[PDB]
Design a protein that fits this description.
part of a larger assembly; 15 chains; A mainly alpha (38); B mainly alpha (30); D mainly alpha (33); F mainly alpha (36); G mainly alpha (34); H mainly alpha (65); I mainly alpha (36); J mainly alpha (341); K mainly alpha (82); L mainly alpha (34); M mainly alpha (334); N mainly alpha (37); K: 82 residues; mainly alpha; Single alpha-helices involved in coiled-coils or other helix-helix interfaces; 0% strand; M: 334 residues; two-stranded antiparallel sheet; 1% strand; binds chlorophyll A; binds pheophytin A; binds ligand PL9; binds 1,2-dipalmitoyl-phosphatidyl-glycerole; photosystem ii (chains B, C); PSII_PsbT (chains B, C); photosynthesis (chains B, C)
Amino acid sequence: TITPSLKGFFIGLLSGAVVLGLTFAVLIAISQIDKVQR
Amino acid sequence: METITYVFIFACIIALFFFAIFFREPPRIT
Amino acid sequence: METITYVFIFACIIALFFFAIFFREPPRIT
Amino acid sequence: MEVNQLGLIATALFVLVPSVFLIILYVQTESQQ
Amino acid sequence: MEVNQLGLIATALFVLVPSVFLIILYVQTESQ
Amino acid sequence: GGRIPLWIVATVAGMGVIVIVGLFFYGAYAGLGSSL
Amino acid sequence: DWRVLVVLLPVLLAAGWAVRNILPYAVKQVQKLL
Amino acid sequence: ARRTWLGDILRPLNSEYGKVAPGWGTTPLMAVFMGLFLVFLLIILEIYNSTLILDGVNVSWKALG
Amino acid sequence: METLKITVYIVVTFFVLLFVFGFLSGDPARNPKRKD
Amino acid sequence: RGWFDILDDWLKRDRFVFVGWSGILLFPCAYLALGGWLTGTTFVTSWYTHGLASSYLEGCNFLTVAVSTPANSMGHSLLLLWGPEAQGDFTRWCQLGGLWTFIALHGAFGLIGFMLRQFEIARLVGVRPYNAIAFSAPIAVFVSVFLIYPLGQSSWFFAPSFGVAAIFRFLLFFQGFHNWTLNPFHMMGVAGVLGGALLCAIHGATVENTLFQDGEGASTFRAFNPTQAEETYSMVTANRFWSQIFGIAFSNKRWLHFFMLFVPVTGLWMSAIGVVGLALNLRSYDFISQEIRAAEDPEFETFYTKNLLLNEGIRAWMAPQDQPHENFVFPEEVLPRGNAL
Amino acid sequence: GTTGERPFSDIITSVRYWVIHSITIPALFIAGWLFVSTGLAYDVFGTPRPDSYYAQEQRSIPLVTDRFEAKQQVETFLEQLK
Amino acid sequence: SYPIFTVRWVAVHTLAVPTIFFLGAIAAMQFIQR
Amino acid sequence: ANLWERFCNWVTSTDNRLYVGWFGVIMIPTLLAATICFVIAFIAAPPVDIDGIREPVSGSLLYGNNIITGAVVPSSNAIGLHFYPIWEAASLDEWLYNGGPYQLIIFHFLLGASCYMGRQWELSYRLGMRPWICVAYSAPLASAFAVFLIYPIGQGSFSDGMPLGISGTFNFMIVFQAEHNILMHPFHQLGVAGVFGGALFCAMHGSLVTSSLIRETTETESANYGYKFGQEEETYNIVAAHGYFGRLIFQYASFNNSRSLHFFLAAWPVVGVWFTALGISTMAFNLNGFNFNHSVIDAKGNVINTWADIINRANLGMEVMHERNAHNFPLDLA
Amino acid sequence: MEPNPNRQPVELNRTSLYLGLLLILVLALLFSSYFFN
Amino acid sequence: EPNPNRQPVELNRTSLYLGLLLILVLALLFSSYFFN
Ligand code: CLA
Ligand code: CLA
Ligand SMILES: C=Cc1c(C)c2cc3nc(c4c5[nH]c(cc6nc(cc1[nH]2)C(C)=C6CC)c(C)c5C(=O)[C@@H]4C(=O)OC)[C@@H](CCC(=O)OC/C=C(\C)CCC[C@H](C)CCC[C@H](C)CCCC(C)C)[C@@H]3C
Ligand SMILES: CC(C)=CCC/C(C)=C/CC/C(C)=C\CC/C(C)=C/CC/C(C)=C/CC/C(C)=C/CC/C(C)=C/CC/C(C)=C\CC/C(C)=C/CC1=CC(=O)C(C)=C(C)C1=O
Ligand SMILES: CCCCCCCCCCCCCCCC(=O)OC[C@H](COP(=O)(O)OC[C@@H](O)CO)OC(=O)CCCCCCCCCCCCCCC
Ligand SMILES: CC1=C(/C=C/C(C)=C/C=C/C(C)=C/C=C/C=C(C)/C=C/C=C(C)/C=C/C2=C(C)CCCC2(C)C)C(C)(C)CCC1
Ligand SMILES: CCCCCCCCCCCCCCCCCC(=O)O
Ligand code: OEY
Ligand SMILES: [Cl-]
Ligand SMILES: [Cl-]
Ligand SMILES: [Fe+2]
């Protein structure tokens, strides 16, 4: 069944996803605002 | 060690035969 | 036999020093 | 001293085989020039 | 078999040294 | 802009380090880690 | 517990004070982004 | 170049050098598979490491019987 | 041993004299630019 | 002109600190590795894993603080915060050694990020990637010593702890238990590091003492312009000097600088290999010929047998306190000791 | 040879910089001070205080000996002081 | 006209802020007695 | 054109394949003496009573050593700092038992190496170079004096100088750590920073220059053939190297002046090795590394071990074992 | 059938010879003690 | 100042094959006596 460590695994998985998705979310936003002029 | 040494020398000679026949200096009419 | 081997390698290195210094390829300008 | 008897052939080929390799390449370099 | 242990190195060098000599002379002939 | 002269910034900053570092060396002889 | 607010107060006050003193010029900056 | 019978049979398998699908093609799909495989390898590692403990998975020699 | 001692005393004195008198022989002048 | 190219644009802007795609991996991991080490050395104990104090808070100084390895009972556990050992409790995680794995793993991924950064910048500027390649050596050392080594032993406990003194203890451990000085892979490393340092000093001094007079000042630094095409020192006079002093000199500037890359990079790679062996206790501990003779002939003594007595003292005198999980109790009467001392 | 950020030399000689930072620096310093002087650091990190490395008549180290009960072990040692 | 907030500003304060905080904590520690 | 002036001119000639010079007039015989005695001793010398306790240590190949274990063994503690030339022994047999060859080798070698340094000055002067390469070599030279002369002076005996051997070197550094704790001494810590940083900057400089070689060759040839001995033009682009390294870090942590760069290369390892040679030379007078043994104690007074105490346990093991038959009294005061 | 166009001469200059022989000899000097053990 | 008496040396492929054969067959002959 769904043991304590498998629960921890999912916690770690979602926390990583939040960190990466939040990071990339912020990086895309900034790059959209502050573009380079060609 | 001695069996291996005899077989190794013999095997080198057999390889030499191969090269001496198939990768010889070709004789050409000069 | 081990002593002979150690000293042989050492003497070959000294000999190499001699050729490397006195029989080097000469540096030549441009 | 009771050393490994094969240490001698080990050492001898360890010196001989790569040294011969270099000498072969050196000499055929000179005879191009 | 209780053979002489310098037999191995004596045979190896008997092959190697003269063989290498010939190989050296042959390769430098081809490149010239 | 260039109001505070830089030599004054760097003297005061410098004495600031001398002080905290001196505090760390005093603490080697007092309190925890002093052997006493 | 209370010791956390004690610790965090100088940080919040200092961050407040820098906000107060820089806000005007930080607005100029954001506007220039198109 | 020399033509041979086997060569002529195999020919079309070596005839599309340099052909690409346009732009990003299936790159988004590739990334999905990569991410699943990372999770899959995390699980396998953490099982071996005993950081992930699962019911009925005794990571020991004693699992041979 | 006394013979060995004497020999080494003489050999060392020889080389040290060469050194001292060699550097006294106008050594600053022995350079490639300005000589005196 | 979609979001990927736009983000690429922004990551690769010329700014005071370049970011790049490699920065997404490098900057978080480098900063966390660093922050974990400063946090742990300032506040965190080693009492429950080691029976040691190890933080400024506890009374330690810069030389004795460390982030110490986890307890031997953790094995090779990743020791994730949310893992089954600490169960999400930050405090217990700290007390159990979690900061050690945190620093080591984030440091590992930071090293990758840095070498990717070297690749990324070199590609954007148009130079060859030899700086990245040179950095493989510190990578090999890090992973072999901090990861491979404790992975072959019983646990992370036996990896280096992150501290000045703790590393000193690592060196001494390796002498007494592994006889690491006798290992030819270390010896090659030594030659490579000492040889690199020698090359560094001898090349800098040669250049500085074969300069061309290119200005009138007594401070010769000002007479160099980064865009001049002309060599600033005389290779020819440097070559003559060294040929007459040492017998041989460099004559090829390219070979010279490649050799400077090669020597220390190779030395570090060699030592990494030896440490891999020591992961398995595959030591160069003994010479068998010497031991057979010495066993039979009590008048045979060499510097090799003298150093093994030193190792035997190191092990017996440091094991109980250095390996507290083993519960070694050595009564006075079994400690090896010479006369009087 | 510039990428457009403001030179540091110009910033730290400026009056506005020092109007903000003569506040923000002592504030951060005193914050860290209180983190320790209040005892909070001990509690956050689990670091023993000088009176809590050993129980009064104990000279054994409270060494963790189990991987999966390690947490409970530390908690048991701590209770042997309370 | 220089911008105030930049990637550089973040990198600088990412290091500077905890540095001063740790310095304050380490200073307090010199007065701890056993 | 007199006999002396001709001789002086040959001694200082810049046409000699190897420069002689006035420093060379001393260097050549002393180095030949040291070298010839070292080779013979290493191969064939009999065991030497290094610690003066009639416990001879075998150092040569014929008496059962290999290359790693062999050494020329230091002179007997019974001699201490007394001068022991050959002619002071009743026989060569005696001189060999008591360790005479060590003294002959180290004194000739230190003399010869000091002259080596001066000879580097001298030739620089004859070639119209700047003079300070010899100052870079003073760092290794100082280090050799420290382990062969200064440390034996402070401790009272050449029997505690470094053996002329590979395993003897290790014995020396282990016993040094037990009696001094060189590792906790800041001058050794700076020596490590000097040689680690030296290796680092060696790799850096080599890789940056190698990274920015100007394309002068095809891929079928060594790029080294793109440089010709004596060409006037630089062979790499320092602005490209600086443009790479200043972005790797930030702009102002990278050199754009090659002279400052190469001075830095010279200075860092030289200065670090000066300090480490001075570390050995001052631990010669027993001003040892930091002692934090039992520095941390708890409210009650229990000792709370740190990694320094663990170091101390290892040092104790080296202390109680070394020269195991040589101490009769409880303190190893030298 | 044409001869193979991809063939190339190989070279080793005298300095590389000296450097390689030194490498080999010093390595043998280093490892020989361990081979004899 | 080059010496005018030097000459190139040659060994053609057939001579290599002949020599290598001689050497291997000699070794195959004598090796039994070397091991004895
Ligand atoms: C590039 C940045 C980076 C990287 C590479 C790492 C890497 C690591 N961290 Mg670090 N970390 C980072 C940034 C990073 N961290 C940041 C910014 C912080 C501050 C928040 C931390 C804080 C942190 C802590 C506190 C800890 C780590 C730990 C770890 C390790 C385990 C990571 C793990 O298991 O992830 C698992 C997760 C992933 C790999 C993410 C996979 C993404 C999947 C595919 C997406 C899944 C889809 C989603 C869930 C679906 C939604 C469903 C929903 C609707 C229900 C590893 C060495 C641990 C450690 O060091 O242990 C010693 C630990 O305890 N990290
Ligand atoms: C003449 C003396 C001498 C010399 C020159 C060396 C040289 C060496 N030793 Mg040996 N050693 C010696 C004596 C000596 N040793 C003796 C007597 C002993 C006792 C047995 C040892 C025991 C010993 C051990 C036990 C080990 C070595 C190792 C090494 C290597 C270290 C390589 C390195 O740079 O690691 C430095 C570390 C790295 C390069 C790793 C990556 C570092 C990254 C880039 C760090 C980035 C820092 C980052 C920016 C943050 C810093 C911030 C913070 C500090 C403020 C090197 C070959 C190691 C080895 O062989 O490794 C394979 C090793 O583990 N030595
Ligand atoms: C102790 C010795 C040592 C140190 C400290 C060191 C340090 C460094 N070398 C670097 C580079 C190099 N090193 C090179 C060759 C060498 N480096 C050597 C030895 C070392 N190199 C040697 C001997 C060589 C010769 C082969 C090259 C060729 C380079 C570079 O190109 C590069 C550079 O730019 O130099 C100027 C820099 C990489 C910065 C980085 O990764 O940022 C990112 C930071 C990260 C990823 C954090 C990693 C954290 C580590 C791995 C774990 C935690 C460490 C703790 C925080 C501190 C612990 C301290 C206690 C143990 C006392 C850095 C300054
Ligand atoms: C709860 C929550 C959410 C938590 C918050 C956590 C959080 C979210 C974290 C995310 C962090 C974040 C957003 C990112 C920003 C973080 C950031 C700023 C990270 C900092 C990372 C960091 C530690 C970086 C490492 C710095 C580093 C080690 C560099 C130090 C400088 C250094 C030692 C440089 C060496 C310079 C030197 C001495 C000379 C070079 C050597 C040498 C002589 C070279 C030779 C040489 C040089 C030349 O020049 C040229 C020309 C040539 C020829 C040549 O030979
Ligand atoms: C004071 C009296 C004179 C002292 C005698 C000195 C003798 C030693 C000199 C070395 C000769 C051998 C070098 C040959 C090799 C040789 O001829 O190199 C010559 C080579 C010249 O380089 P160039 O730039 O001309 O050539 C590069 C191009 O050809 C590219 O292919 O120099 C080097 O590469 C420098 C680095 C050599 C670094 C090795 C030197 C130190 C090695 C010490 C070895 C010690 C082992 C000891 C074992 C016991
Ligand atoms: C771990 C962790 C984390 C992170 C953290 C961090 C990020 C931190 C950082 C931190 C920091 C970042 C810190 C810092 C500190 C610093 C210091 C403490 C400093 C000091 C300094 C010094 C002391 C110096 C001095 C000096 C000298 C001595 C000489 C010269 C001058 C000078 C001044 C330099 C988290 C949260 C995620 C969670 C998990 C865990
Ligand atoms: C792929 C990159 C991964 C990046 C971040 C991964 C780690 C982020 C840290 C988040 C962990 C903190 C929350 C988990 C705390 C555990 C609490 C609990 O177990 O209930
Ligand atoms: O360290 Mn310990 O201390 Ca200087 O002496 Mn007393 O013993 Mn002995 O001879 Mn060599 O060594
Ligand atoms: Cl001893
Ligand atoms: Cl005594
Ligand atoms: Fe250079």
